[PDB]
Symmetry: C3
Protein backbone atom coordinates (compact mmCIF):
# COMPACT_ATOMS: atom_id res chain seq x y z
CA UNK A 1 0.00 0.00 0.00
CA UNK A 2 2.31 2.74 -1.32
CA UNK A 3 1.50 6.38 -2.00
CA UNK A 4 -0.41 7.92 -4.90
CA UNK A 5 1.12 9.07 -8.15
CA UNK A 6 1.32 12.82 -8.55
CA UNK A 7 3.24 15.39 -10.54
CA UNK A 8 5.73 17.99 -9.38
CA UNK A 9 4.56 21.51 -10.24
CA UNK A 10 6.13 24.94 -9.89
CA UNK A 11 5.31 27.19 -6.94
CA UNK A 12 2.35 29.55 -7.52
CA UNK A 13 4.15 32.56 -6.00
CA UNK A 14 7.48 33.71 -4.51
CA UNK A 15 5.90 34.67 -1.19
CA UNK A 16 4.66 31.10 -0.76
CA UNK A 17 8.21 29.76 -0.83
CA UNK A 18 8.83 31.45 2.53
CA UNK A 19 6.66 28.72 4.04
CA UNK A 20 9.03 25.96 2.96
CA UNK A 21 5.97 23.69 2.68
CA UNK A 22 5.02 21.50 -0.26
CA UNK A 23 1.89 23.24 -1.49
CA UNK A 24 -1.20 21.29 -2.49
CA UNK A 25 -4.83 21.33 -3.55
CA UNK A 26 -7.47 21.31 -0.83
CA UNK A 27 -9.04 18.54 -2.89
CA UNK A 28 -6.09 16.23 -2.15
CA UNK A 29 -4.90 17.18 1.34
CA UNK A 30 -5.34 19.52 4.29
CA UNK A 31 -2.72 21.91 5.63
CA UNK A 32 -0.57 20.51 8.39
CA UNK A 33 -0.48 16.93 7.16
CA UNK A 34 3.02 15.71 6.31
CA UNK A 35 4.00 13.64 3.31
CA UNK A 36 6.88 11.48 2.26
CA UNK A 37 7.74 12.10 -1.39
CA UNK A 38 9.48 9.19 -3.11
CA UNK A 39 11.45 10.34 -6.14
CA UNK A 40 13.35 7.08 -6.62
CA UNK A 41 14.63 3.98 -4.81
CA UNK A 42 17.37 6.23 -3.42
CA UNK A 43 15.31 9.07 -1.96
CA UNK A 44 12.23 9.74 0.18
CA UNK A 45 11.90 13.42 1.08
CA UNK A 46 9.59 14.58 3.84
CA UNK A 47 7.53 17.74 3.46
CA UNK A 48 4.85 19.50 5.48
CA UNK A 49 1.81 20.60 3.48
CA UNK A 50 -0.05 23.84 2.97
CA UNK A 51 -3.00 24.32 0.63
CA UNK A 52 -3.37 27.05 -1.97
CA UNK A 53 -6.22 27.61 -4.47
CA UNK A 54 -3.96 27.71 -7.53
CA UNK A 55 -2.43 24.25 -7.15
CA UNK A 56 -3.74 21.88 -9.80
CA UNK A 57 -5.41 18.83 -8.20
CA UNK A 58 -3.11 15.84 -8.60
CA UNK A 59 0.01 17.95 -8.39
CA UNK A 60 2.33 19.14 -5.62
CA UNK A 61 3.94 22.57 -5.91
CA UNK A 62 7.59 23.07 -4.95
CA UNK A 63 9.74 26.21 -4.89
CA UNK A 64 13.16 26.37 -6.56
CA UNK A 65 15.14 25.55 -3.37
CA UNK A 66 13.00 22.47 -2.70
CA UNK A 67 13.34 21.28 -6.30
CA UNK A 68 17.10 21.58 -6.10
CA UNK A 69 17.24 19.88 -2.71
CA UNK A 70 14.87 17.13 -3.81
CA UNK A 71 16.34 16.80 -7.29
CA UNK A 72 12.92 17.48 -8.82
CA UNK A 73 11.99 18.79 -12.23
CA UNK A 74 8.68 20.30 -13.33
CA UNK A 75 6.31 17.67 -14.72
CA UNK A 76 8.08 14.81 -12.99
CA UNK A 77 5.90 12.00 -11.68
CA UNK A 78 6.36 11.43 -7.95
CA UNK A 79 4.90 8.98 -5.45
CA UNK A 80 3.28 10.65 -2.40
CA UNK A 81 2.11 9.14 0.89
CA UNK A 82 0.97 10.67 4.18
CA UNK A 83 3.75 10.64 6.75
CA UNK A 84 3.09 10.49 10.46
CA UNK A 85 5.31 11.82 13.23
CA UNK A 86 4.46 9.73 16.27
CA UNK A 87 7.66 8.90 18.12
CA UNK A 88 9.56 11.00 20.66
CA UNK A 89 12.83 10.49 18.75
CA UNK A 90 11.36 12.43 15.82
CA UNK A 91 10.94 15.70 17.72
CA UNK A 92 13.81 18.11 17.12
CA UNK A 93 15.88 18.84 20.23
CA UNK A 94 18.61 20.92 18.60
CA UNK A 95 19.33 21.88 15.01
CA UNK A 96 22.29 23.72 13.48
CA UNK A 97 21.64 25.98 10.50
CA UNK A 98 24.07 27.61 8.08
CA UNK A 99 22.80 31.05 7.09
CA UNK A 100 23.69 33.69 4.48
CA UNK A 101 21.98 36.43 2.47
CA UNK A 102 19.77 34.94 -0.23
CA UNK A 103 20.70 37.45 -2.91
CA UNK A 104 24.51 37.49 -2.84
CA UNK A 105 23.95 40.98 -4.22
CA UNK A 106 22.08 42.54 -1.29
CA UNK A 107 24.44 42.34 1.69
CA UNK A 108 24.38 44.67 4.70
CA UNK A 109 27.07 44.86 7.38
CA UNK A 110 24.41 45.36 10.07
CA UNK A 111 24.53 42.89 12.99
CA UNK A 112 21.70 40.37 13.21
CA UNK A 113 20.47 38.99 16.54
CA UNK A 114 20.43 35.22 16.16
CA UNK A 115 18.36 34.73 19.31
CA UNK A 116 15.71 36.83 17.61
CA UNK A 117 16.03 34.79 14.41
CA UNK A 118 15.83 31.51 16.30
CA UNK A 119 12.62 32.61 18.01
CA UNK A 120 10.97 33.70 14.78
CA UNK A 121 12.22 30.54 13.05
CA UNK A 122 10.50 28.41 15.71
CA UNK A 123 7.44 30.64 15.44
CA UNK A 124 6.79 30.32 11.72
CA UNK A 125 8.04 26.75 11.33
CA UNK A 126 6.49 25.16 14.41
CA UNK A 127 5.13 21.70 13.57
CA UNK A 128 6.95 21.55 10.22
CA UNK A 129 9.40 18.86 9.14
CA UNK A 130 13.07 19.51 8.42
CA UNK A 131 15.87 17.25 7.20
CA UNK A 132 19.67 17.44 7.37
CA UNK A 133 20.86 19.04 4.14
CA UNK A 134 17.57 20.75 3.34
CA UNK A 135 17.73 24.23 1.83
CA UNK A 136 15.25 26.89 2.86
CA UNK A 137 14.33 30.51 2.29
CA UNK A 138 14.03 32.56 5.49
CA UNK A 139 12.43 35.99 5.71
CA UNK A 140 13.78 38.07 8.58
CA UNK A 141 13.55 41.82 9.18
CA UNK A 142 12.33 42.31 5.60
CA UNK A 143 15.45 40.52 4.29
CA UNK A 144 15.72 37.12 2.62
CA UNK A 145 18.27 34.57 3.79
CA UNK A 146 19.33 31.17 2.52
CA UNK A 147 19.44 28.39 5.09
CA UNK A 148 21.10 24.99 5.06
CA UNK A 149 20.21 22.48 7.76
CA UNK A 150 23.61 21.25 8.96
CA UNK A 151 22.58 18.98 11.87
CA UNK A 152 19.56 17.75 13.86
CA UNK A 153 19.39 16.01 17.24
CA UNK A 154 16.55 14.51 19.27
CA UNK A 155 16.07 15.02 23.02
CA UNK A 156 18.07 12.53 25.09
CA UNK A 157 15.52 10.62 27.26
CA UNK A 158 20.82 11.76 19.33
CA UNK A 159 21.50 12.41 15.64
CA UNK A 160 18.45 12.20 13.39
CA UNK A 161 17.88 12.55 9.66
CA UNK A 162 14.55 14.35 9.77
CA UNK A 163 12.53 15.85 12.58
CA UNK A 164 9.56 17.96 13.61
CA UNK A 165 10.13 21.47 14.93
CA UNK A 166 8.39 21.94 18.27
CA UNK A 167 8.03 24.76 20.79
CA UNK A 168 11.25 23.98 22.64
CA UNK A 169 13.46 23.08 19.66
CA UNK A 170 16.81 24.94 19.88
CA UNK A 171 18.20 26.50 16.71
CA UNK A 172 21.85 27.50 16.39
CA UNK A 173 23.05 29.53 13.41
CA UNK A 174 26.41 30.06 11.77
CA UNK A 175 27.25 32.01 8.64
CA UNK A 176 28.47 30.34 5.46
CA UNK A 177 32.18 30.53 4.68
CA UNK A 178 33.16 33.97 3.36
CA UNK A 179 29.82 35.34 4.56
CA UNK A 180 29.59 39.08 5.07
CA UNK A 181 26.88 38.35 7.65
CA UNK A 182 27.57 39.63 11.16
CA UNK A 183 25.70 37.41 13.60
CA UNK A 184 25.33 38.38 17.25
CA UNK A 185 23.49 36.75 20.15
CA UNK A 186 23.70 33.36 21.86
CA UNK A 187 21.85 31.39 19.17
CA UNK A 188 25.12 31.00 17.30
CA UNK A 189 27.12 27.77 16.89
CA UNK B 1 -36.51 34.81 -2.87
CA UNK B 2 -36.09 31.72 -5.10
CA UNK B 3 -34.26 33.25 -8.04
CA UNK B 4 -30.49 33.59 -7.69
CA UNK B 5 -28.45 36.33 -6.04
CA UNK B 6 -27.19 39.54 -7.65
CA UNK B 7 -23.43 39.82 -7.97
CA UNK B 8 -20.73 41.45 -10.10
CA UNK B 9 -18.33 39.89 -12.59
CA UNK B 10 -14.72 40.57 -11.57
CA UNK B 11 -11.25 39.95 -13.02
CA UNK B 12 -9.31 36.80 -12.18
CA UNK B 13 -6.84 37.44 -9.33
CA UNK B 14 -3.99 35.56 -11.06
CA UNK B 15 -3.06 33.77 -14.29
CA UNK B 16 -2.31 30.54 -12.47
CA UNK B 17 -5.87 30.43 -11.17
CA UNK B 18 -7.27 30.36 -14.69
CA UNK B 19 -5.84 26.84 -15.09
CA UNK B 20 -8.63 25.69 -12.75
CA UNK B 21 -11.36 26.85 -15.15
CA UNK B 22 -13.51 27.47 -12.07
CA UNK B 23 -15.46 30.61 -11.26
CA UNK B 24 -13.55 31.95 -8.27
CA UNK B 25 -15.34 33.31 -5.23
CA UNK B 26 -15.09 34.59 -1.68
CA UNK B 27 -15.25 32.00 1.12
CA UNK B 28 -17.79 34.43 2.55
CA UNK B 29 -20.28 33.70 -0.22
CA UNK B 30 -19.59 30.06 -1.16
CA UNK B 31 -17.45 26.99 -0.54
CA UNK B 32 -15.24 25.29 -3.12
CA UNK B 33 -16.90 22.49 -5.05
CA UNK B 34 -20.38 23.97 -5.13
CA UNK B 35 -21.65 24.64 -8.65
CA UNK B 36 -23.52 27.72 -9.80
CA UNK B 37 -25.68 28.73 -12.69
CA UNK B 38 -24.83 32.25 -13.84
CA UNK B 39 -27.53 34.17 -15.66
CA UNK B 40 -26.39 36.99 -17.93
CA UNK B 41 -29.88 37.61 -19.32
CA UNK B 42 -32.87 35.66 -20.64
CA UNK B 43 -31.90 32.83 -22.99
CA UNK B 44 -28.35 32.96 -21.59
CA UNK B 45 -27.15 30.93 -18.61
CA UNK B 46 -23.73 29.45 -17.90
CA UNK B 47 -22.79 26.75 -15.37
CA UNK B 48 -19.54 27.02 -13.41
CA UNK B 49 -17.85 25.07 -10.63
CA UNK B 50 -16.54 27.21 -7.76
CA UNK B 51 -13.21 27.60 -6.02
CA UNK B 52 -12.51 30.11 -3.25
CA UNK B 53 -9.56 32.51 -3.17
CA UNK B 54 -8.76 35.16 -0.52
CA UNK B 55 -8.49 38.04 -3.00
CA UNK B 56 -12.00 37.80 -4.43
CA UNK B 57 -14.16 40.70 -3.28
CA UNK B 58 -17.26 39.48 -1.41
CA UNK B 59 -20.29 39.93 -3.66
CA UNK B 60 -18.28 39.33 -6.81
CA UNK B 61 -17.35 36.31 -8.93
CA UNK B 62 -13.95 36.25 -10.65
CA UNK B 63 -13.63 34.99 -14.24
CA UNK B 64 -10.60 34.77 -16.55
CA UNK B 65 -10.72 36.52 -19.95
CA UNK B 66 -11.63 33.24 -21.76
CA UNK B 67 -14.49 32.59 -19.35
CA UNK B 68 -15.70 36.16 -19.81
CA UNK B 69 -15.55 35.76 -23.59
CA UNK B 70 -17.54 32.51 -23.53
CA UNK B 71 -20.22 33.81 -21.16
CA UNK B 72 -20.15 37.14 -22.96
CA UNK B 73 -19.42 38.97 -19.73
CA UNK B 74 -17.66 42.26 -19.19
CA UNK B 75 -15.97 43.39 -15.99
CA UNK B 76 -18.36 44.96 -13.48
CA UNK B 77 -21.31 43.39 -15.28
CA UNK B 78 -24.15 42.54 -12.91
CA UNK B 79 -25.10 38.88 -12.92
CA UNK B 80 -27.61 36.60 -11.25
CA UNK B 81 -26.05 33.67 -9.41
CA UNK B 82 -27.77 30.60 -7.97
CA UNK B 83 -26.43 27.30 -6.65
CA UNK B 84 -26.76 24.55 -9.24
CA UNK B 85 -27.15 20.91 -8.28
CA UNK B 86 -26.08 17.88 -10.31
CA UNK B 87 -28.35 15.07 -9.17
CA UNK B 88 -29.42 13.06 -12.20
CA UNK B 89 -27.54 10.26 -13.95
CA UNK B 90 -28.03 11.95 -17.35
CA UNK B 91 -25.85 14.83 -16.15
CA UNK B 92 -22.71 12.75 -15.67
CA UNK B 93 -20.33 12.94 -18.62
CA UNK B 94 -19.88 9.65 -20.46
CA UNK B 95 -17.81 10.92 -23.37
CA UNK B 96 -16.60 14.37 -24.38
CA UNK B 97 -14.75 15.54 -27.49
CA UNK B 98 -12.25 18.36 -27.14
CA UNK B 99 -10.53 20.47 -29.78
CA UNK B 100 -6.99 21.29 -28.67
CA UNK B 101 -4.26 23.65 -29.80
CA UNK B 102 -1.29 25.41 -28.21
CA UNK B 103 -2.71 28.32 -26.24
CA UNK B 104 0.07 30.57 -27.53
CA UNK B 105 1.12 31.11 -31.15
CA UNK B 106 4.59 31.57 -29.65
CA UNK B 107 5.37 28.09 -28.30
CA UNK B 108 4.30 25.71 -31.07
CA UNK B 109 6.78 22.81 -31.11
CA UNK B 110 6.15 19.67 -33.16
CA UNK B 111 6.75 17.10 -30.40
CA UNK B 112 4.38 14.13 -29.75
CA UNK B 113 1.45 14.37 -27.31
CA UNK B 114 -0.14 11.21 -25.94
CA UNK B 115 -3.86 12.01 -25.94
CA UNK B 116 -4.08 9.20 -23.41
CA UNK B 117 -1.77 10.94 -20.96
CA UNK B 118 -3.59 14.25 -21.47
CA UNK B 119 -6.99 12.63 -21.04
CA UNK B 120 -5.93 11.07 -17.73
CA UNK B 121 -4.56 14.33 -16.36
CA UNK B 122 -7.60 16.21 -17.65
CA UNK B 123 -9.87 13.85 -15.69
CA UNK B 124 -7.52 14.18 -12.71
CA UNK B 125 -7.56 17.94 -12.33
CA UNK B 126 -11.13 18.50 -13.52
CA UNK B 127 -12.90 15.68 -11.71
CA UNK B 128 -16.25 16.87 -10.34
CA UNK B 129 -16.20 20.07 -12.40
CA UNK B 130 -18.89 21.16 -14.85
CA UNK B 131 -18.30 21.57 -18.59
CA UNK B 132 -20.55 22.74 -21.42
CA UNK B 133 -20.49 22.26 -25.19
CA UNK B 134 -18.68 25.26 -26.69
CA UNK B 135 -16.83 26.20 -23.51
CA UNK B 136 -13.24 27.42 -24.00
CA UNK B 137 -10.63 26.37 -21.39
CA UNK B 138 -6.94 26.74 -20.57
CA UNK B 139 -5.13 23.43 -20.08
CA UNK B 140 -1.67 23.08 -18.54
CA UNK B 141 0.14 19.97 -19.73
CA UNK B 142 3.84 19.14 -19.50
CA UNK B 143 4.62 22.73 -18.59
CA UNK B 144 2.87 23.93 -21.76
CA UNK B 145 -0.41 25.82 -22.09
CA UNK B 146 -3.12 24.65 -24.49
CA UNK B 147 -6.45 26.09 -25.53
CA UNK B 148 -9.41 23.73 -25.39
CA UNK B 149 -12.84 23.89 -26.99
CA UNK B 150 -15.52 21.47 -25.83
CA UNK B 151 -17.07 20.16 -29.02
CA UNK B 152 -19.38 17.44 -27.79
CA UNK B 153 -20.64 15.78 -24.61
CA UNK B 154 -22.62 12.56 -24.14
CA UNK B 155 -24.17 10.88 -21.11
CA UNK B 156 -23.94 7.14 -20.42
CA UNK B 157 -26.71 4.91 -21.74
CA UNK B 158 -27.88 2.20 -19.28
CA UNK B 159 -27.05 10.70 -25.30
CA UNK B 160 -26.15 14.28 -26.28
CA UNK B 161 -26.12 16.75 -23.39
CA UNK B 162 -25.38 20.48 -23.17
CA UNK B 163 -23.59 20.50 -19.83
CA UNK B 164 -22.24 17.73 -17.65
CA UNK B 165 -20.12 16.76 -14.66
CA UNK B 166 -16.73 15.14 -15.24
CA UNK B 167 -16.45 11.93 -13.22
CA UNK B 168 -13.78 9.28 -12.76
CA UNK B 169 -14.77 7.20 -15.78
CA UNK B 170 -15.53 10.07 -18.20
CA UNK B 171 -13.83 9.51 -21.57
CA UNK B 172 -12.07 12.42 -23.26
CA UNK B 173 -11.17 12.39 -26.94
CA UNK B 174 -8.97 15.12 -28.40
CA UNK B 175 -8.60 16.47 -31.94
CA UNK B 176 -6.35 19.34 -32.99
CA UNK B 177 -7.75 22.55 -34.43
CA UNK B 178 -7.61 23.06 -38.20
CA UNK B 179 -4.12 24.04 -39.34
CA UNK B 180 -2.72 23.01 -35.95
CA UNK B 181 0.82 21.67 -35.79
CA UNK B 182 -0.27 19.45 -32.90
CA UNK B 183 1.48 16.10 -33.09
CA UNK B 184 -1.22 14.08 -31.32
CA UNK B 185 -0.82 10.36 -30.63
CA UNK B 186 -2.37 7.61 -28.54
CA UNK B 187 -5.86 6.10 -28.66
CA UNK B 188 -7.65 9.10 -27.12
CA UNK B 189 -8.63 10.84 -30.36
CA UNK B 190 -11.89 11.54 -32.21
CA UNK C 1 -5.29 38.59 29.73
CA UNK C 2 -2.81 39.99 27.20
CA UNK C 3 -2.46 39.29 23.49
CA UNK C 4 0.40 37.52 21.72
CA UNK C 5 3.47 39.20 20.30
CA UNK C 6 3.71 38.98 16.50
CA UNK C 7 5.52 40.82 13.71
CA UNK C 8 4.14 43.12 11.02
CA UNK C 9 4.71 41.75 7.52
CA UNK C 10 4.15 43.00 3.98
CA UNK C 11 0.99 42.18 2.07
CA UNK C 12 1.38 39.08 -0.14
CA UNK C 13 -0.34 40.71 -3.15
CA UNK C 14 -1.86 43.99 -4.37
CA UNK C 15 -5.26 42.42 -4.96
CA UNK C 16 -5.43 41.41 -1.30
CA UNK C 17 -5.23 45.04 -0.23
CA UNK C 18 -8.71 45.61 -1.71
CA UNK C 19 -10.04 43.64 1.29
CA UNK C 20 -8.72 46.21 3.81
CA UNK C 21 -8.32 43.25 6.21
CA UNK C 22 -5.22 42.35 8.23
CA UNK C 23 -4.16 39.07 6.59
CA UNK C 24 -3.04 36.11 8.65
CA UNK C 25 -2.06 32.46 8.74
CA UNK C 26 -4.90 29.95 9.07
CA UNK C 27 -2.63 28.50 11.75
CA UNK C 28 -3.07 31.53 13.99
CA UNK C 29 -6.62 32.72 13.25
CA UNK C 30 -9.73 32.18 11.15
CA UNK C 31 -11.22 34.68 8.70
CA UNK C 32 -13.82 36.98 10.19
CA UNK C 33 -12.35 37.24 13.66
CA UNK C 34 -11.37 40.79 14.62
CA UNK C 35 -8.20 41.84 16.37
CA UNK C 36 -6.96 44.81 18.29
CA UNK C 37 -3.35 45.53 17.36
CA UNK C 38 -1.43 47.28 20.13
CA UNK C 39 1.40 49.09 18.38
CA UNK C 40 2.39 50.90 21.57
CA UNK C 41 1.15 51.32 25.17
CA UNK C 42 -1.26 54.15 24.27
CA UNK C 43 -2.45 52.99 20.84
CA UNK C 44 -4.57 50.02 19.82
CA UNK C 45 -5.87 49.56 16.30
CA UNK C 46 -8.72 47.37 15.15
CA UNK C 47 -8.62 45.13 12.11
CA UNK C 48 -10.80 42.38 10.65
CA UNK C 49 -8.93 39.24 9.59
CA UNK C 50 -8.69 37.18 6.43
CA UNK C 51 -6.41 34.19 5.98
CA UNK C 52 -4.03 33.63 3.09
CA UNK C 53 -1.61 30.68 2.53
CA UNK C 54 1.43 32.92 2.04
CA UNK C 55 1.33 34.66 5.42
CA UNK C 56 4.13 33.43 7.68
CA UNK C 57 2.75 31.97 10.94
CA UNK C 58 3.42 34.43 13.75
CA UNK C 59 3.09 37.43 11.47
CA UNK C 60 0.25 39.70 10.36
CA UNK C 61 0.33 41.11 6.82
CA UNK C 62 -0.62 44.75 6.19
CA UNK C 63 -0.78 46.89 3.04
CA UNK C 64 1.19 50.15 2.84
CA UNK C 65 -1.87 52.29 3.59
CA UNK C 66 -2.51 50.21 6.72
CA UNK C 67 1.12 50.40 7.84
CA UNK C 68 1.10 54.19 7.39
CA UNK C 69 -2.14 54.64 9.33
CA UNK C 70 -1.12 52.50 12.31
CA UNK C 71 2.52 53.62 12.32
CA UNK C 72 3.93 50.16 11.70
CA UNK C 73 7.14 49.26 9.96
CA UNK C 74 7.97 45.84 8.53
CA UNK C 75 9.29 43.39 11.12
CA UNK C 76 7.96 45.51 13.98
CA UNK C 77 6.78 43.70 17.10
CA UNK C 78 3.10 44.12 17.86
CA UNK C 79 0.78 42.73 20.49
CA UNK C 80 -2.29 41.13 18.97
CA UNK C 81 -5.47 40.13 20.78
CA UNK C 82 -8.88 39.00 19.55
CA UNK C 83 -11.39 41.83 19.64
CA UNK C 84 -15.09 41.23 20.11
CA UNK C 85 -17.93 43.42 18.87
CA UNK C 86 -20.80 42.75 21.25
CA UNK C 87 -22.55 46.04 22.01
CA UNK C 88 -25.22 47.85 19.99
CA UNK C 89 -23.24 51.11 20.15
CA UNK C 90 -20.49 49.46 18.10
CA UNK C 91 -22.62 48.88 15.01
CA UNK C 92 -22.19 51.58 12.38
CA UNK C 93 -25.32 53.65 11.77
CA UNK C 94 -23.83 56.23 9.41
CA UNK C 95 -20.31 56.84 8.14
CA UNK C 96 -18.89 59.65 6.01
CA UNK C 97 -16.12 58.82 3.55
CA UNK C 98 -13.79 61.13 1.62
CA UNK C 99 -13.07 59.64 -1.80
CA UNK C 100 -10.43 60.32 -4.48
CA UNK C 101 -8.57 58.50 -7.27
CA UNK C 102 -5.96 56.17 -5.80
CA UNK C 103 -3.34 57.40 -8.28
CA UNK C 104 -2.90 60.56 -10.36
CA UNK C 105 -2.25 58.60 -13.56
CA UNK C 106 -5.74 57.12 -13.18
CA UNK C 107 -7.59 60.44 -13.13
CA UNK C 108 -10.58 60.82 -15.45
CA UNK C 109 -13.93 62.59 -15.81
CA UNK C 110 -16.27 59.61 -15.78
CA UNK C 111 -19.26 59.78 -13.44
CA UNK C 112 -19.28 57.39 -10.49
CA UNK C 113 -22.61 56.81 -8.74
CA UNK C 114 -22.39 57.24 -4.97
CA UNK C 115 -25.55 55.20 -4.28
CA UNK C 116 -24.06 52.38 -6.32
CA UNK C 117 -20.71 52.78 -4.56
CA UNK C 118 -22.36 52.79 -1.14
CA UNK C 119 -24.19 49.55 -1.90
CA UNK C 120 -21.07 47.77 -3.13
CA UNK C 121 -19.09 49.19 -0.20
CA UNK C 122 -21.59 47.64 2.24
CA UNK C 123 -21.53 44.45 0.15
CA UNK C 124 -17.81 43.76 0.25
CA UNK C 125 -17.12 45.21 3.70
CA UNK C 126 -20.08 43.81 5.61
CA UNK C 127 -19.01 42.66 9.08
CA UNK C 128 -15.65 44.44 8.84
CA UNK C 129 -14.33 47.01 11.30
CA UNK C 130 -13.59 50.62 10.38
CA UNK C 131 -12.20 53.56 12.36
CA UNK C 132 -12.31 57.33 11.96
CA UNK C 133 -9.22 58.41 10.02
CA UNK C 134 -8.57 54.99 8.48
CA UNK C 135 -7.40 55.06 4.82
CA UNK C 136 -8.63 52.30 2.50
CA UNK C 137 -8.34 51.12 -1.09
CA UNK C 138 -11.69 50.76 -2.88
CA UNK C 139 -12.18 48.94 -6.18
CA UNK C 140 -15.18 50.22 -8.12
CA UNK C 141 -16.04 49.73 -11.80
CA UNK C 142 -12.55 48.45 -12.47
CA UNK C 143 -11.08 51.67 -10.99
CA UNK C 144 -9.15 52.12 -7.74
CA UNK C 145 -10.10 54.84 -5.27
CA UNK C 146 -8.55 56.05 -2.04
CA UNK C 147 -10.92 56.37 0.90
CA UNK C 148 -10.60 58.25 4.18
CA UNK C 149 -13.12 57.55 6.94
CA UNK C 150 -14.26 61.02 8.03
CA UNK C 151 -16.93 60.20 10.60
CA UNK C 152 -18.86 57.30 12.14
CA UNK C 153 -22.08 57.28 14.14
CA UNK C 154 -24.01 54.58 15.96
CA UNK C 155 -27.76 54.08 15.88
CA UNK C 156 -29.60 56.19 18.44
CA UNK C 157 -31.74 53.85 20.63
CA UNK C 158 -23.82 59.01 18.45
CA UNK C 159 -20.18 59.58 17.47
CA UNK C 160 -17.95 56.52 17.71
CA UNK C 161 -14.27 55.95 16.96
CA UNK C 162 -14.55 52.44 15.52
CA UNK C 163 -17.49 50.37 14.35
CA UNK C 164 -18.72 47.30 12.51
CA UNK C 165 -20.30 47.68 9.10
CA UNK C 166 -23.68 45.94 9.01
CA UNK C 167 -26.38 45.47 6.37
CA UNK C 168 -28.17 48.73 7.11
CA UNK C 169 -25.11 50.94 7.64
CA UNK C 170 -25.34 54.12 5.58
CA UNK C 171 -22.34 55.45 3.72
CA UNK C 172 -22.09 59.03 2.47
CA UNK C 173 -19.25 60.08 0.16
CA UNK C 174 -17.66 63.42 -0.65
CA UNK C 175 -14.67 64.11 -2.86
CA UNK C 176 -11.32 65.31 -1.56
CA UNK C 177 -10.52 68.99 -2.03
CA UNK C 178 -9.43 69.72 -5.61
CA UNK C 179 -10.44 66.21 -6.60
CA UNK C 180 -11.39 66.19 -10.28
CA UNK C 181 -13.54 63.20 -9.33
CA UNK C 182 -17.00 63.29 -10.95
CA UNK C 183 -19.47 62.03 -8.33
CA UNK C 184 -23.17 61.49 -9.03
CA UNK C 185 -25.96 59.81 -7.08
CA UNK C 186 -27.73 60.71 -3.84
CA UNK C 187 -25.34 58.97 -1.43
CA UNK C 188 -23.40 62.20 -1.00
CA UNK C 189 -22.63 64.59 1.83
Amino acid sequence: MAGRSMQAARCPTDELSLSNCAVVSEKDYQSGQHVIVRTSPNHKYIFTLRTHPSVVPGSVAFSLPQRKWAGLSIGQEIEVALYSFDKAKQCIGTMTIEIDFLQKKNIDSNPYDTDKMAAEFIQQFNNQAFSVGQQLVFSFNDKLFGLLVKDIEAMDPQKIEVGLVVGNSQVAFEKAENSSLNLIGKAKT
